[PDB]
Design a protein around this ligand. Structure first.
Ligand SMILES: [Mg+2]
Ligand SMILES: [Mg+2]
Ligand SMILES: [Zn+2]
Ligand SMILES: [Zn+2]
Ligand SMILES: [Zn+2]
Ligand SMILES: [Zn+2]
Lengths: 193, 97, 269, 171, 178, 85, 550, 112, 87
């Protein structure tokens, strides 16, 4: 936004949240009447509600950066439920699981998740290792590098950023590391911006 | 602060029709929608600047009305449609009484 | 449930009580066509006491030396004795009073005299005295004709329902029945002259106020009547602090119209 | 054609206007809004008849703002053209595609195709015209057209005409 | 704020119903011959021939100048100049539609006087043809029963060829020699 | 972007108020930005209804090691009218 | 403000309820909805031409809303459509769909009973469509044959042939979200497909369905089965783009992505080699996701669950309870120009008065219109500013342009014009609505006269405690400020405390002398109580009305 | 006689607590419960199953189910009910809304 | 239909003004006065649009008519000038 009335290059405009307006500090003109509490709005997607009682909790958060655009809902046993239908419907979802070579490469994330928990590594490290891997796995710069060592290299790339200290020898023992190979794969990815 | 169902009951029980309307519209929700006069839907593509209206589907650019209803009502109505129910609103009568 | 049930019920411009469909619930609000905020518990008299006492209080026999109005009561008193033409007005007056007595005893079987009605006639009379400085020792300027017919005329002016048709006029007459019983009992010839000792100026004013006050008491079309009834039953149910099932748990049975009810009994007379 | 129609418009007055010159301002507002308009439903709302007997009626006061709304009933002369209507008018434009004929408030375009065989667009004429051995149609001439079709554009009504058939054209 | 009519109609939700307008005298839903007064009584459709339309608008605007001068208290070629004066006094000045309409009627009218206009109104009303046909009969100058029946297809068998010919002979005589 | 109408001036370059500064409603206690490109303002102001003096400020890291700050604000509540006993 | 529209302002008189014609659902639509992907045109910051805004509604402080533009505060949202691979029953009508099948002849389409049947002729006579359908059903649910030969209304010696087809009727039963028949040594039992039901429903006569309570224009039986899905615009199902690795999508958006994913799969299955049983499998899954999006709390069926274990907030769920769109958002709603604090009693206040803490009075506002009466005073308030008590917070121009008086440099200077509104502080004698919850009767909400006072509490007279059901043991009460000259009259004229003294509840006064006053009034009245001159004078003067006569 | 018994019964519940509610209020409730021809319950399957507005009936207890059936029944709400005008955010036809106010030019011009 | 308009003679409602009518009248006129409408009474130094409207009401100089709708759709128009204020 910018004030029509005045218009001096740097627009000195204030958000008077409690009064619910976006105002021009210089002239006094209210530029917007509709204002939302962002923090309280975010609390309808992410909340204390696991029960499903909350009329406020109406949405669900997602990680575009990692999950991409995959919106899905579990078919599960509710209060009244004949197990027959839950099986039938889930059996049906199985036949409809004809996902791509990369929509099946999200199983490489399931590997990193199993490798981080085993390495006693934090959630942020996974979300960094799963990030660096999702960006370098398809790369020509990496080509036919030992696939087992490429994802182990992204675990060190994740650990370096999240300040969680882990030795190359530690990650080397965690999966299986061909020292020269997982040192070369950790450099092509490091070169990949 | 919540001007709820029971508080509503009291304002009715008094007879203050306008104070009720004020509290429900002006003091809260208060929204403006353009409705087609053929189907009772809010499917008008109102281009306020260009003074252009039009509800294609009825191919009507003529029979348009603007209504002042609470936003939550507009929501209810859009929720009813999302579920295949048509809450057709009309500005004319057709019944007597 | 009471609110949501009685929600749409309101008084209409024809003194009727209908819902959002125009379906008649009551034909005239609260049977009488009155706003409850303008009602007061008032003594019906005529209903109670011995027949002997009633004949003392109300009977006026201008044709009998002892049962005539003593000339201490009115100027007219000396020339009123044995007035055949006038006695017909009083015979009719008293007739109506006994008609009222048999009637009220049919309405309130047990003989309860204190019923809420509009217009506090007692206080109007009190105020007429307090104002005109009524001399409790001097004979009134009022004529039998002044009283008899004035009270007759006031009855005609106490309208709840205006409507030229017969149905409406009967409806109007029926709604004023009980109140007119009170009016007649209170404004009887003997009572006015003996008990109240009112002047013509005083009595005319007394009538004038009865009219304006009565009219003021009548319901206002628009009265949210239904929500009112619901809140008026609802609120005191909240105040209920708990071998027949009683209070809140029994009110529950009633509103649900529960077929399997807790304490079923029958009072065999 | 050219009809007299009984019509009613709703005008919403602001309380500062609830003065003695109320009726005057509303009869004026009717003429502002209505007179000279064009709707597909009615055609050209041309002239409001009986300026004295215009009926203002009572004004329902709205409940949020203090403003009042009146349904002003008036009589007017309207002009609505119809497919099949034969109309006399004047040539007002003349291109290589045909010519337009002004007929009262509206123009009628006679395409170079709904025209007699030998009557053809000549550009060497001044101004350019349609030149048959027995006809010259240009920028000022009187013509009799048949309305072939109307196109409703809520501000104006356009039409397409013909002079091909018998009894039509130059007059 | 869109200007309404004198008749009621059932909003069947199915907009799709509207049929075309013609020379089958299939005018609009508005313009059908059995229409309604502002006083609610069913009256017949009012279609005017020019001359008739010219006298109407003229009269209308003169009554208006009066009204404006009242509130102020507290040859054909000559007609073209005169009407342009009246319009600059009675109309919004912005009425290009009405200014053209008037230029048109002043130049295209067959009958000038109210007396003549009535003589047409009389002679044509024995026929009992649709009010649209009489207007076209008063506006379009025909010499033959065929010219008329061709330019006005709507007729065809409503009137006799010879009877219509009499009407035309009478209208040509009534035509004002400007 | 979307800065609070409050005063940022009480904050030292570390995005924190030094303990001892007297605060007031809408005043900013924790200066924070969620860079996304230049950056939004994710700062922490004092509850409007309140005021007082900053009591203690602690800077730390959690199990996984995230820099987190805790700010103590001391006020003296004196008995007044609507107060319950 | 919200920009001007030339469209005529009218009031809703009637609400025509109905069902969507799949043709209408398609007709309204502004977009195709082909992808179960929200936005991110692959690692991007924009909406895909497939789910939210594929030509759709507006969000993100950006106008772009297909020609309409408008954006957030003006755009109502525009509906898209999803075209279903096969038909699905609408959850809500599975019940009615079963009841319609039981009435009508399967494969034939005719009504099982006629004007020929004595008890049916009676049922067909019912005026209430709802009551009529119940009557029609009860009779022909037992009719297990579409008759062709029927005895005449003269004598059964000669049989008048009615509508054709002499087929057996199935004993229809609900099994999950499927309808299962049984035609009568051992019967034939199979599943009635949505497709059949739909074609059988289309075949039901207008007169026939019209008797079943349906309507030829707004609600036909065939429309109880879904084919074309109205896709709600984002304002119905909001999104929040947090911090580029955090994005919040509405449960309904998830559920639509499931419908689409399911639909896309079945489409491919039917297009390719149809393996029958593999298709009916995919179908029932689409049937679920569609059903489960409208209502997730289905009996017998498993629930749609969001990863967290949380069950999906369906459309039914949102409208449903007290806190639901009806009860909690329309019949009731939180409001502006409202205040709440603790209550305390003031024996010095008048009955009809309410004590207002200065802080509240300084926050709450009245928009007074500039007239040549208030003109000078309003200028002075504007000049005083929002900080000082008798003052003003905002000035509202003819245009709608509102100015925050705490930012205008030439505050006192503002040359006010008639018609401009000045949003001034709540002042002494302004009429306010006072309320103690639970608002159990009309006297729980009464209009009061303001008295701007010191200290954080609403001060009230005690004789007013009785109707509110108030005690000064930490109770709180609510204030509501009327914003119109009209609404304040409704308050001062019908709701004002003095008008509530004698109550219609029980034809007697609802307020009397209580507590201290009540205790002391007896004590002052005893024959022993005697006052001497010194105190008599003080007492006399204490009566504000006193005639000055000892 | 049922209506009489029902008044008596309600009256007696109010009179047990030693309270008093003016006759008319309990009359109205009882009158409602019976005008149907039988004893109509003040429950979801009683008073709420009448043939009033759909938006009216949905505000109490059956919301969605009432609205689905209202859709399939092609029901018409004439919006007379207080509930409907509140949902619609309109001036209710109650008290101050039970009539309509107009200006008369004739009298305006008379006064000034 | 506008046939539902009940004639002057033949009106059957209270010749008196309902608490609601008067409340709406005062509210309406007071709104109009604040909207900058012309006042139909000499304001003897008055300033409050309500106090002003009440003066108009008491002098019976308010050009407003109450259209009382009847349960069937019929209506009776009553001028404030004719209606009785007794409340
Ligand atoms: Mg308490
Ligand atoms: Mg207490
Ligand atoms: Zn500015
Ligand atoms: Zn439409
Ligand atoms: Zn839009
Ligand atoms: Zn069959």
């Amino acid at each position: 936004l910018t004030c029509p009335e005045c218009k001096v290059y740097p627009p000195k405009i204030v958000e008077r949240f409690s009064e619910g307006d976006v105002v021009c500090a210089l002239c006094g003109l209210v530029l917007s009447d509709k204002l939302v509490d962002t923090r309280s709005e975010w609390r309808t997607f992410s909340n204390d509600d696991h029960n499903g009682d909350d009329p406020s909790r109406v949405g669900e958060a997602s990680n575009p950066l990692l999950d991409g655009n995959n919106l899905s809902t579990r078919i599960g046993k509710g209060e009244t439920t004949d197990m027959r239908f839950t099986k039938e419907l889930n059996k049906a979802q199985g036949k409809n699981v004809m996902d791509k070579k990369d929509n099946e490469v999200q199983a490489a994330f399931a590997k990193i998740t199993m490798l981080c928990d085993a390495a006693e590594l934090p959630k942020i490290v996974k979300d960094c290792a799963k990030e660096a891997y999702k960006l370098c796995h398809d790369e020509k710069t990496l080509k036919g590098k030992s696939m087992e060592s490429i994802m182990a290299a992204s675990i060190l790339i994740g650990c370096r950023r999240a300040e969680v200290a882990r030795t190359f020898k530690e990650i080397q023992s965690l999966i299986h590391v061909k020292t020269k190979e997982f040192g070369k794969t950790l450099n092509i990815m490091k070169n990949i911006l | 602060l919540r001007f709820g169902e029971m508080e509503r009951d009291c304002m009715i029980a008094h007879g203050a029709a306008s104070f009720l309307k004020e509290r429900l519209m002006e003091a809260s929700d208060a929204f403006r929608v353009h409705i087609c006069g053929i189907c009772g839907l809010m499917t008008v593509i109102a281009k306020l600047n260009h003074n252009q209206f039009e509800c294609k589907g009825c191919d009507n650019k003529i029979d348009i009305y603007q209504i002042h209803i609470p936003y939550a009502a507009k929501l209810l109505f859009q929720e009813l449609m999302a579920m295949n129910i048509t809450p057709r609103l009309y500005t004319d009568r057709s019944r007597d009484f | 449930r009471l609110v949501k049930a009685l929600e749409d019920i309101m008084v209409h411009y024809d003194n009727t009580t209908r819902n959002s469909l125009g379906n008649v619930i009551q034909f005239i609000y609260g049977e009488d066509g009155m706003d409850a905020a303008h009602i007061e518990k008032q003594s019906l008299d005529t209903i109670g006491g011995s027949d002997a006492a009633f004949e003392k209080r109300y009977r006026v026999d201008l044709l009998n030396t002892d049962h005539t109005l003593d000339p201490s009561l009115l100027e007219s008193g000396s020339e009123i004795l044995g007035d055949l033409k006038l006695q017909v007005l009083l015979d009719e007056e008293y007739k109506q009073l006994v008609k009222d007595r048999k009637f009220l005893r049919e309405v309130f079987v047990d003989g309860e005299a204190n019923w809420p009605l509009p217009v506090n006639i007692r206080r109007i009379i009190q105020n007429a005295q307090q104002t005109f400085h009524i001399d409790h020792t001097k004979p009134s300027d009022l004529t039998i004709k002044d009283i008899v017919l004035g009270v007759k005329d006031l009855q005609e002016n106490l309208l709840v329902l205006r409507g030229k048709n017969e149905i409406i006029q009967n409806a109007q007459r029926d709604a004023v029945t009980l109140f007119c019983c009170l009016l007649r009992s209170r404004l009887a010839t003997r009572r006015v002259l003996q008990e109240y000792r009112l002047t013509k100026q005083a009595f005319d004013w007394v009538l004038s106020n009865i009219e304006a006050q009565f009219l003021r008491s009548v319901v206002h079309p628009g009265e949210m009547v239904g929500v009112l009834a619901a809140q008026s039953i609802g609120e005191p149910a909240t105040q209920m602090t708990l071998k027949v099932t009683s209070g809140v748990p029994r009110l529950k049975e009633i509103l649900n119209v529960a077929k399997n009810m807790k304490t079923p009994s029958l009072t065999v007379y | 054609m050219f009809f007299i129609k009984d019509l009613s418009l709703n005008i919403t007055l602001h309380p500062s206007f609830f003065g003695p010159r109320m009726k005057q301002y509303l009869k004026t507002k009717l003429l502002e809004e209505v007179e000279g308009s064009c709707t597909g439903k009615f055609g050209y709302i041309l002239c409001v008849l009986d300026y004295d007997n215009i009926d203002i009626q009572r004004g329902r006061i709205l409940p949020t703002d203090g403003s009042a709304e009146f349904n002003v009933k008036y009589r007017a002369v309207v002009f609505k053209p119809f497919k099949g209507e034969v109309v006399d008018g004047t040539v007002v434009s003349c291109s290589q595609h045909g010519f337009e004929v002004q007929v009262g408030p509206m123009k009628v375009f006679v395409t170079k195709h709904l025209m007699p065989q030998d009557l053809t667009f000549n550009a060497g004429s001044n101004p350019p015209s349609y030149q048959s051995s027995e006809d010259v149609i240009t920028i000022k001439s009187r013509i009799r057209v048949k309305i072939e079709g109307c196109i409703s554009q809520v501000s104006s009504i356009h039409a397409i005409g013909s002079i091909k058939e018998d009894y039509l054209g130059a007059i | 704020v869109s200007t309404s009519t004198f008749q009621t109609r059932r909003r069947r939700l199915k907009k799709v119903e509207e049929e075309e307008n013609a020379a089958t005298l299939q005018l609009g839903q508005e313009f059908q011959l059995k229409q309604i007064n502002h006083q609610g009584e069913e009256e017949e459709l009012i279609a005017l021939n020019l001359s008739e339309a010219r006298l109407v608008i003229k009269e209308a605007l003169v009554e208006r100048r009066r009204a404006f001068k009242r509130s102020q208290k507290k040859t054909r070629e000559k007609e073209l100049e005169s009407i342009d004066v009246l319009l600059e006094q009675t109309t919004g000045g912005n009425n290009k539609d009405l200014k053209n309409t008037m230029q048109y009627l002043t130049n295209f009218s067959r009958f000038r006087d109210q007396e003549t206009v009535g003589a047409v109104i009389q002679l044509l009303k024995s026929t009992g043809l649709h009010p649209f046909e009489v207007a076209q009969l008063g506006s379009l100058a025909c010499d033959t029963a065929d010219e008329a029946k061709t330019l006005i297809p709507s007729l065809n068998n409503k009137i006799s060829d010879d009877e219509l010919e009499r009407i035309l002979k009478e209208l040509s005589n009534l035509e004002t020699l400007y | 972007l979307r800065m609070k109408h409050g005063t940022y001036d009480k904050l030292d370059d570390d995005g924190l108020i030094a303990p001892g500064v007297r605060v007031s409603g809408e005043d900013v206690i924790i200066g924070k930005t969620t860079p996304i490109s230049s950056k939004r303002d994710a700062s922490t102001p004092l509850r409007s209804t309140e005021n007082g003096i900053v009591d203690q400020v602690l800077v730390t890291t959690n199990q996984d090691g995230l820099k987190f700050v805790k700010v103590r604000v001391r006020t003296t509540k004196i008995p007044q009218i609507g107060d319950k006993f | 403000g919200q920009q001007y529209s030339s469209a005529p302002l009218r009031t809703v008189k009637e609400v025509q309820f109905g069902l969507f014609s799949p043709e209408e659902v398609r007709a309204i639509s502004v977009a195709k909805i082909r992808f179960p992907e929200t936005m991110d045109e692959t690692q991007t910051r924009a909406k895909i031409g497939g789910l939210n805004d594929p030509r759709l509604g507006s969000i993100d402080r950006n106008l772009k809303c297909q020609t309409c533009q408008e954006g957030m505060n003006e755009c109502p949202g525009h509906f898209g459509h999803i075209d279903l691979a096969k038909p699905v029953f609408h959850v809500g009508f599975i019940a009615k769909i079963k009841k319609v099948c039981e009435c009508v002849c399967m494969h034939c389409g005719k009504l099982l009973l006629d004007e020929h049947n004595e008890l049916m002729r009676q049922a067909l006579a019912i005026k209430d469509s709802k009551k009529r359908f119940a009557a029609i059903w009860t009779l022909c649910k037992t009719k297990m044959v579409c008759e062709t030969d029927v005895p005449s209304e003269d004598d059964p010696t000669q049989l008048v042939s009615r509508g054709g087809c002499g087929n057996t009727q199935p004993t229809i039963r609900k099994d999950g979200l499927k309808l299962v028949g049984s035609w009568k040594d051992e019967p034939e039992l199979r599943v009635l497909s949505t497709e059949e039901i739909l074609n059988i429903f289309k075949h039901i006569s207008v007169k026939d369905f019209t008797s079943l309570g349906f309507n030829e224009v707004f609600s036909r039986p065939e429309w109880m089965i879904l084919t074309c899905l109205p896709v709600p615009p984002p304002p119905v199902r909001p999104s929040i783009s947090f911090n580029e690795s955090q994005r919040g999508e509405d449960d309904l958006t998830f559920k639509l992505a499931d419908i689409l994913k399911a639909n896309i799969s079945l489409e491919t299955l039917e297009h390719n080699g149809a393996p029958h049983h593999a298709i009916e499998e995919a179908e029932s899954l689409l049937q679920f996701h569609v059903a489960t999006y409208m209502d997730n709390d289905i009996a017998g069926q498993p629930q749609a669950l969001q990863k967290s274990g949380r069950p999906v907030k369906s459309i039914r769920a949102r409208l449903k309870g007290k806190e639901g769109r009806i009860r909690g958002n329309l019949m009731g709603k939180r409001v502006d120009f409202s205040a709440r604090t603790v209550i305390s009693g003031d024996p010095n206040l008048e009955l009809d008065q309410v004590g207002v803490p200065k802080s509240i009075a300084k926050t709450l506002t009245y928009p007074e219109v500039v007239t040549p009466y208030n003109i000078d005073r309003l200028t002075q308030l504007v000049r005083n500013g929002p900080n000082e008590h008798p003052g003003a917070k905002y000035v509202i121009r003819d245009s709608g342009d509102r100015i925050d008086l705490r930012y205008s440099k030439r505050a006192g200077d503002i040359q006010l014009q008639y018609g401009w509104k000045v949003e001034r502080h709540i002042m002494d004698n302004d009429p306010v609505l006072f309320n103690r919850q639970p608002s159990l009767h009309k006297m729980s909400m009464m209009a009061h006269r303001v008295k701007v006072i010191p200290y954080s509490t609403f001060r009230l007279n005690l004789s007013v405690t009785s109707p509110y059901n108030a005690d000064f043991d930490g109770d709180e009460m609510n204030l509501h400020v009327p914003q119109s000259e009209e609404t304040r009259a409704e308050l001062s004229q019908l709701c004002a405390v003095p008008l509530q003294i004698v109550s219609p509840q029980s034809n007697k006064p609802c307020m009397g002398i209580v507590q201290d006053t009540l205790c002391g009034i007896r004590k002052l009245t005893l024959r022993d109580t005697f006052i001497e001159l010194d105190q008599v004078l003080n007492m006399l003067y204490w009566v504000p009305d006193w005639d000055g006569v000892i | 006689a049922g209506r009489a018994a029902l008044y008596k019964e309600v009256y007696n519940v109010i009179a047990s607590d030693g309270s008093y509610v003016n006759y008319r209020h309990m009359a109205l409730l009882v009158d409602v419960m019976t005008t149907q021809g039988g004893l109509t319950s003040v429950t979801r399957h009683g008073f709420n199953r009448s043939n009033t507005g759909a938006l009216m009936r949905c505000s109490f207890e059956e919301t969605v189910e009432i609205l689905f059936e209202a859709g399939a029944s092609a029901e018409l709400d004439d919006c007379r009910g207080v509930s409907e005008n509140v949902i619609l955010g309109q001036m209710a036809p109650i008290g101050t809304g039970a009539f309509d106010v107009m200006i008369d030019e004739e009298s305006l011009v008379k006064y000034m | 239909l506008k046939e539902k308009a009940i004639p002057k003679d033949q009106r059957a409602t209270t010749p008196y003004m309902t608490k609601y009518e008067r409340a709406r009248i005062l509210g309406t006129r007071a709104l109009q006065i604040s909207m900058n409408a012309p006042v139909f009474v000499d304001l003897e130094g008055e300033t409050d649009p309500l106090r002003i409207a009440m003066k108009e009401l008491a002098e019976k100089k308010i050009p407003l008519v109450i259209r009382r709708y009847l349960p069937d759709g019929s209506f009776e128009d009553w001028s404030v000038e004719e209606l009785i204020v007794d409340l």
